[PDB]
Amino acid sequence: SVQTPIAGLVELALSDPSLQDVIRRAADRPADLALVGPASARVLVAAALAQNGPLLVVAATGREADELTAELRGVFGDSVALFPSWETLPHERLSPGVETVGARLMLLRRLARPDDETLGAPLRVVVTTTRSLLQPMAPDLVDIEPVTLSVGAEMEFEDVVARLVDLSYTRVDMVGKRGEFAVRGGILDVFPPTAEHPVRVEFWGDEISEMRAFAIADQRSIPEVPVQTVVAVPCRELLMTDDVRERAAALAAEHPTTENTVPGTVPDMLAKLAEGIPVDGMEALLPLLHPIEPTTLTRHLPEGAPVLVCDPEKVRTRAADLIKTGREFLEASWSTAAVGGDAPIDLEALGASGFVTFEEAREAAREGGHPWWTLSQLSDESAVELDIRSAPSARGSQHNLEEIFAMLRAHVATGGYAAVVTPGIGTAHRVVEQLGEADTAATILEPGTAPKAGVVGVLKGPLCSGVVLPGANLVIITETDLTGNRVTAAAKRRNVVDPLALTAGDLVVHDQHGIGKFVEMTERVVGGARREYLVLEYASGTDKLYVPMDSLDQLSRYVGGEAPSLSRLGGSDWANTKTKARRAVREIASELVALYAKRQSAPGHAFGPDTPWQAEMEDAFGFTETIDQLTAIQEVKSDMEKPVPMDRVICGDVGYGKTEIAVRAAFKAVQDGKQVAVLVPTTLLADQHLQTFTNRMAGFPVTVKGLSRFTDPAESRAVIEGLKDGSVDVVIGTHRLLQTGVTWKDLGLIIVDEEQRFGVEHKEHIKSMRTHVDVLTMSATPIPRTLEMSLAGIREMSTILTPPEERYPVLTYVGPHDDKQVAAALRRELLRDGQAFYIHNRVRTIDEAAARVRQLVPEARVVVAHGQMNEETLEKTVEGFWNREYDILVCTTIVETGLDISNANTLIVERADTFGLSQLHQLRGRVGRSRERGYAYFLYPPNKPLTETAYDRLATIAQNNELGAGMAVAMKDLEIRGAGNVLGAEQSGHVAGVGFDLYVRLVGEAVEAYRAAADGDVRIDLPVDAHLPPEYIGSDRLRLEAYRRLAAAADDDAVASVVDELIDRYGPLPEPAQRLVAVARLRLLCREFGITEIGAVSASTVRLSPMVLPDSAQLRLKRMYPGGHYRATTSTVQVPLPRAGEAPRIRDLELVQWVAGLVLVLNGKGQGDVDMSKF
């Protein structure tokens, strides 16, 4: 169907007798076959060889392997698969991505099991790289029995979790990444490395009861994704057996280092391997841990399958680079000095897993029964040269374009077949229009068909470069050849809404008491009820406060002051500290709402709907728009169209595509005749956004111009500044656009980027421009959503959480500063013509530091950059680094965090101990954003003993984790300065002592009281065994979230949604949980009638604390509930509990309901208004 688009076109291409000649030659399986043809013919040749049976194709680099893999999936779909290459060198102390290992093992198991439907269709073409071809592997990797999960299979829970542990699956309390799994009572969550969505399986007894795929963000199940049998393949290329623990204990005996275990060294690694847990960099130790004879990839191919090698010369030339780089990483990582100096393991054994040479792989493939064939673009004498010519590539000069369309017209006039293959979405109709203007009959082909004779067929399919086959009377021309651009290729949100982490000793702020230190969580019984309480230390200095589970909304994690405040006490010292800040925030809210109102009543020309060109400009997008991006463009366009001048923020990570929203909004404002500006803090951003605005808006009468610091004063004084005549439709500029001399003619839209970095004078300038014209800001720092909805009326902010393309996480390595590892990593990043960040914050020595870098890599262009330089030199240096003039940038953290160099994907942090967690995460984030995998090296000095807090900190970032250990604790800090960039106040004085969460909560109070300018807890002490049992929710961090979120639910349907959350996430509700739910609904019923407290004064009586009763309801209390009296002075209603039998007092749901009906009949309504027997 639409799954094999170019199957008909290729099936037509095979009609050429040269490809059929190749099919005949390969049909008898000859020993030597040398083919010669153009590069773009690869997809053809393979597709011919696959007609006689399966085969393995080898490409030079991973990019060519991905390209040919897609081009073959366009004709074969699921039958052709890609055997990926490791992101790490074989002996490097870093493990590759779990997704890569998953794809490798799934592909090998598919090669060993073609009949297995659950793994996929039988293989016909396997495309791989030189690395994966040369990199050996253990022959027992395919024999590892995966964890097969099906609805109805009879299994045993603990055996399943144990088997998952053996397959290098990391156990966590919440599934967030691939290769993870969480264990809950009767429910197993697991994220296989090859599955698109993580799957949750419900066990009952000794067999699975249900299966359903869920989403990572809300952790809620997706019912519209049907889940068949899932095959959980291992996540590492090894098995954690008892033998590998034995040898890890023999090797672990030497280099023991029992005390003061360094994080990244080999005593810790081998110690944890003897303990059985998987650790990073484990694969390199395969020849010593699991010693066998390692075979190559070609053995796992089904017997008889041949091997076609594309451009073998380049395959060899790169192969030498794999062997050299891998050898350098082996010597570097496992030198005598780096293994702790003691009993250095011999490297000869470790050489077993290293890359085999080209000749060894050749003879190993031939001696295994698999022929070795070649396809080379260069002409050879004894080779079978195919009748295939490459496509004419019109460089972009439209005379060549018209000539190409003319040769197409002549070819179809003769009767030959012409096909124009366009992989882009929205570009086929454009080619149809171009052919119509060139007077050529065009037709958008049905996906999977062949071009009809006499008409050119515009087809949507994956192709890079076209191919001309005169033997088949066929001419295939790709969109790439016509436009000179390569089109590479859905997305799931990553909200991850489930953490409010707490560790022992952490500081929290209680609204009614103050700052205190967390201790633990306990449970006490008062009348047969297991109750849960969270404890805090409040300096009296030994006073402990047990906050219950009904008032968790008053607990805010203390953030703000880096220096800790002193814990509060039972006195009245804290209420004042609340009140003064409460008086210090409304001053901010005043400016906020006054800006919103001045914006509301201001006169500004609205923007009409999108003109006809906007569709073509939006469809000229190289990539694919994202759902969050589409909603953001709709909101931005609508706010432009609304008469109120626009003041909208765009929140998203660096590398998520908000700049496209900028260019599209700017274009929309241009189409209505209004010129626009873009304000950036640094000149580098003016150049980047300048080039993006050029490329996206080219081909239209729109002159884009920029005014940076380095724009010469001739063009600056004349062209840019003198453009008050409508000469510029859009100007990208730095702060020079904010001086007095500037002037606009019909300024229509302002685009701000990284508004936080601007100067204060420039900030007040931009805010002054806000009221008069439409503004549109972009931010990489996120904001707390509580502030998003707290200040929603004055300033709308749209969030983008759908990644445009899967940006796989960078590979972090914590370790001692070894020069060989640094040099090896820098040279590996230089191999792909990449760049690297080297961080040495001590400015005094930065020069010397860079010199030492040049000691390690002499062929590296190394430069320095720091904040002490004047901007005229610094921005020029950073410009040189962005223009690839330099290879390694030694800089301080201030300079590094604030650059967007996409080509830089390797980071070296010297003296990583000195940096905080947040700074380390920021540093790491600035690499590995593009299509390339990033690397990060957090290094601590080896000449001094590491500190305790550096050991802990480095340990948190060591095991790369998104958990509540600190990634979330230090994410809040990333939101603090974001708030400072959003709201006007920068002072942290009132934050320190109140808590930033309570600070912006008071901000919420003030701005909600000011927004409505025109307008001008219940305690239940009942003997009801209600709690969330630990067996139901094992993880305390999640159970506290269930408590809090259940308490915060404000209506019955919200409580029901919480119930559905607990049911889906953790399983069916137990009795104490349902009783707690009924207690919450009882709290709502109290709030409707304003009851503050319902407490049992004694074992036989109950008191409703605040009620006034008129004479009618007082008499009704006497008649319907005898024995009870109403005390008007204290204004309480005290009634006695009826005994259950003739004896025990009533409890649990009988008591809850009885109290409900009592409240009802006392407050007018009948006893049959509602029942608490639900849920």
Ligand SMILES: Nc1ncnc2c1ncn2[C@@H]1O[C@H](COP(=O)(O)OP(=O)(O)O)[C@@H](O)[C@H]1O
């Ligand atoms: N939908 C997409 N898929 C893949 N890459 C994209 C997509 N949109 C934009 N990009 C790439 O990512 C970058 C877009 O982000 P950028 O323009 O740097 O602003 P920001 O990083 O703030 O989103 C560009 O370099 C672009 O090539």
